[PDB]
Amino acid sequence: MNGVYDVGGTDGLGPINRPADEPVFRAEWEKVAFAMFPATFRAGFMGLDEFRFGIEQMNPAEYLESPYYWHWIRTYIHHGVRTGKIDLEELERRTQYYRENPDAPLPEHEQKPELIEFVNQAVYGGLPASREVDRPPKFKEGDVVRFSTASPKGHARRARYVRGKTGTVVKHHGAYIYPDTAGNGLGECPEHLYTVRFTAQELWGPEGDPNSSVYYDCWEPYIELV
Amino acid sequence: MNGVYDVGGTDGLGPINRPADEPVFRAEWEKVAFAMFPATFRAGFMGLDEFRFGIEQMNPAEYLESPYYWHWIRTYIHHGVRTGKIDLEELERRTQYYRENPDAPLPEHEQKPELIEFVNQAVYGGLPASREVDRPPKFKEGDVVRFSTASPKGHARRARYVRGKTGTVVKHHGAYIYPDTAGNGLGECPEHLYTVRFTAQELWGPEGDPNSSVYYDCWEPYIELV
Amino acid sequence: TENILRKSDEEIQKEITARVKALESMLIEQGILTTSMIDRMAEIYENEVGPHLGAKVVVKAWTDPEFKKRLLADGTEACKELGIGGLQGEDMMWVENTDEVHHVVVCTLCSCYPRPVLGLPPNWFKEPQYRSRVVREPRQLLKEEFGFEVPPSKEIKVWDSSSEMRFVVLPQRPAGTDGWSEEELATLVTRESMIGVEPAKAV
Amino acid sequence: TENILRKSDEEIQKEITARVKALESMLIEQGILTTSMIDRMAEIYENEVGPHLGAKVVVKAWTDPEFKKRLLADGTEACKELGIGGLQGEDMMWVENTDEVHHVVVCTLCSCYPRPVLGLPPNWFKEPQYRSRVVREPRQLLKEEFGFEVPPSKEIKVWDSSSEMRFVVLPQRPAGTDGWSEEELATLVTRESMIGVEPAKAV
Ligand SMILES: [Co+2]
Ligand SMILES: [Co+2]
């Protein structure tokens, strides 16, 4: 989708706010929000591409200025409603309850070894997205290609700043989960993946740095020979 | 500039809010904000192109959800600071004063016939932007042209959705004030102006309406033959 | 749209009101803004300039083919025939709805609108929802928001007012109105019909 | 940045806290989230995984040309030599700063970052200020924000992590460090130097 969240090349967003140091987690609610990712992923709320798409559907004014882990909460609720696993009325009632009784207990529950094993395995084992496919790569290093001007309304990884621009294939990586299917719940449908080099003149015109290039990763359908 | 305010083609902004009716002015402060335009324009704070650029430099999160005439206030303050006609410290003090004393009087002042005459003349006479220039038009009806991928950091009228796209010249209008100079305080520098027709397929790829076109106005430097 | 970061409408109005009164006090002291200037602008666009003016133009074009020709050739000059013109209509171009083409106007970069014939735009025209969507999904937007179904085979032409050219739609004359008076025909012409978001009123 | 519409930080935190506790109560009742799962994730990224791991990789590459070769050929496989790897580093590609090229990494679409070697990204990396600007004015951004002046003649290559490939910068070895130990060299390697926003520490 052509969301505001695809911010590369947007002007006017202001200077970077970078404190001299910062903790990994600024508040206990951020640790909760962070750990909710393996929890909802294991539970089938969403895969990684679908998680990103939920964030992209946020109110852009809320997206631009909210704490980052709030984006994570929005996407869990999005997918919880989508899949019928979260009742919004119940969530709204519970929110007010914890607004009025912030120190009330969480619900009684049992700890589960299998959740600790799931987390350690994800963290240290990884969740690789590479896949084998039947077809060989369409493109190769040195090929000069143009990026698609398609504008899907669902999830994709087609930054507006690269669309219709011409670049050179730098590397073929093998095939991977394809976001335009996976993030829209249409499955992995893996496609070959390439890094492509675009000059700053190609991307920005004469306002580009004269000695700069951006490398962006393109799934096969995103590019064709010029 | 590549601001968020250039919203054509952005997805995710949500459904239109359209009440069944509405007044022209929703509150007395909007009448003030509206009338401040001829007042600051006559006073030399800004011309029309410069007024638009001040709004484009807003915090995008504030832009997207504020009342429209608040954008006007931001641009008057921007240009008042730029030109040294508004002292921000004094403005900040006066704001708090009227926060704490909302019904305090405005300053004693004299009415001025010349301001009423200025307003009636602007409204009914107009402020035409057409200008005569030395050179004839470079382009003509039927010419197939591509829109520039330049990305100025100051004011311009180069919607990101049209950049690098190909369209056909529909009409030449004569020359007009050129925004890329005028909105950056570099003067009128008038350029010929054309309407150009872009298909929805050209703009949006296969997600475009198959039977639709967008007409966009291009100053001469914005376009070249394909 | 929900934004957990946003103050209430009442808090926002209270803050804007103070900010505006402060800036007003400064411009008053500069001698550049007065209460009668503010009142005059508000009277002109509350009561003098508004879509009743465009409606007169439309009905003349419907009942006068030579005027319609002049109106489509040079909208500013044609509208001056009726004493209509001025600020933010110095360069009007009117475009004609037909059985083959439907037109809709937008200012994707801001809010530009043909003020001398329509007065100031309604809020939804100036807001990012309409502005973002109409150049990309005009047929869906007209259906979903305005109840207006433009069949897939009919071309929709969207005019984005990026320059000081101000586009105005001449809507098609409703069936069933043969020989009606200019006054009767005017009851059918709405601002929405001159923006292109609705047709002129049936009946 | 000032936004007259926005609640205070304290009001925003108070609302988020309630919303999160509510959602937490529901996921707890579903049996899918527990206090020990939450505590485990926080311990791993507070104390187990972080840029000290990337620093070990950098210093090995600086002191071992054959390893450096392996690291630039296949970053995941090379880092596994040191027992380093996992989530959001399943496909690492390291890129080498030299006198001719300077590299900087970004996730313009979100916040993607090479977690197994750097831990979670600092807030400024995930925010729209850095993400929007670095692909368009990288030389100015490095000067203005990081005090880092890359001469105009040196190419700056910006790597936008749009796929699950995770780019990591191998910064150039500071002058004056010949024959230093791996432990001494590590004191020079910062997360910023592996993002490409600063060079490794002088001295
Ligand atoms: Co406008
Ligand atoms: Co990311």
Swiss-Prot record, chains A, B:
Signal peptide (from-to): none
Recorded catalytic activity of this chain's protein: an aliphatic primary amide = an aliphatic nitrile + H2O
Biotech use, per record: Industrial production of acrylamide is now being developed using some of these enzymes.
GO biological process, one term: nitrile catabolic process
EC number: 4.2.1.84
Gene3D superfamilies: 2.30.30.50, Nitrile hydratase, beta subunit
Temperature-activity note from the record: Optimum temperature is 60 degrees Celsius.
Molecular function GO labels: nitrile hydratase activity; transition metal ion binding
Pfam families named in the record: NHase_beta_C (PF02211), NHase_beta_N (PF21006)
Keywords associated with the record: Lyase
Organism domain of life: Bacteria
The protein's role, per its UniProt record: NHase catalyzes the hydration of various nitrile compounds to the corresponding amides.
Similarity annotation: Belongs to the nitrile hydratase subunit beta family.
Subunit structure: Heterotetramer of two alpha and two beta chains.
Protein name per the record: Cobalt-containing nitrile hydratase subunit beta
Organism of this sequence: Pseudonocardia thermophila
UniProtKB/Swiss-Prot annotation, chains C, D:
List of residues binding Co(2+): 107, 110-112
GO molecular function: cobalt ion binding; nitrile hydratase activity
Temperature impact on function: Optimum temperature is 60 degrees Celsius.
Enzyme nomenclature, EC number: 4.2.1.84
Residues carrying Cysteine sulfenic acid (-SOH): 112
Cofactor info, note text: Binds 1 Co(2+) ion per heterodimer.
Cofactors (names): Co(2+)
Role according to the record: NHase catalyzes the hydration of various nitrile compounds to the corresponding amides.
The protein's name: Cobalt-containing nitrile hydratase subunit alpha
